[PDB]
Write a protein that binds this ligand. Structure first.
Ligand SMILES: *[C@@H](C(=O)O)[C@H](O)C(=O)N[C@@H](CC(C)C)C(=O)NCCCCNC(N)=[NH2+]
Length: 214
């Protein structure tokens, strides 16, 4: 169970790695393949040298995969899942991703590490891939938060309105980044999540500039 869970992710991690090697350049086939397992698997997130290396889910709601893994089995750690509002094909300004932080170096435990500049330095880039392209996540802000909204905004009203969001995001960061974001760029937010009804004013958020490298 608690070790079978690592078995599954191990299997899958190794599976994904070979797919990303067989087809290489092409990404369309790697996910058409993962979709056989579960049609709700819409992407992959990986950070080399860490345990952050999982498939990303998406359901009709934001609690669909809270306590479910990629093969739809109940698990306290659920899955890493995209906001039910976000778009796979054509990204929104801000694509949100959520995942647990139970403290055993799995799922989104690694987000906490980004609160240290040192760690940020050694890990400025996170890989994100899906059925439509390869992307590179350029981390530029990491912080702890008590609020439950605002940083959960998919699309925006206008450049002025969006400009503010980027500015606050930057102001809230507890680490210095040499990246440069603008109302032009699209961003991705990584946030931790507690079980449903599991009150906790402590959340960790990581925001990055989304670069399509394909
Ligand atoms: C954990 C998190 O990181 O926020 C989890 O996704 C969550 O608490 N989400 C919010 C909802 C949106 C950010 C508005 C929440 O109210 N928690 C319960 C699940 C949300 C209910 N379902 C939907 N579709 N809003």
């Amino acid at each position: 169970e608690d070790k079978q869970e690592r078995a599954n992710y191990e299997k899958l991690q190794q599976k994904f790695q070979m797919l990303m090697s067989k087809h290489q350049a092409h990404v369309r086939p790697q996910f058409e393949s993962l979709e056989k397992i579960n049609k709700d698997i819409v992407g992959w997130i990986k950070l080399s040298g860490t345990s952050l290396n999982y498939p990303v889910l998406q359901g009709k709601t934001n609690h669909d995969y809270l306590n479910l893994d990629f093969e739809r089995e109940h698990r306290r750690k659920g899955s890493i899942f995209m906001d039910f509002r976000n778009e796979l094909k054509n990204l929104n300004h801000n694509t949100i991703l959520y995942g647990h932080h139970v403290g055993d170096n799995t799922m989104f435990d690694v987000l906490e590490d980004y609160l240290k500049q040192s760690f940020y330095e050694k890990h400025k880039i996170i890989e994100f891939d899906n059925k439509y392209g390869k992307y590179q996540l350029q981390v530029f802000s990491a912080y702890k938060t008590t609020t439950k909204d605002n940083y959960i905004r998919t699309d925006f009203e206008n450049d002025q309105d969006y400009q503010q969001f980027l500015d606050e995001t930057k102001r809230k960061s507890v680490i210095n980044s040499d990246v440069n974001v603008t109302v032009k760029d699209r961003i991705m937010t990584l946030s931790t999540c507690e079980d449903a009804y599991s009150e906790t004013t402590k959340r960790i958020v990581v925001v990055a500039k989304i670069i399509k490298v394909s």
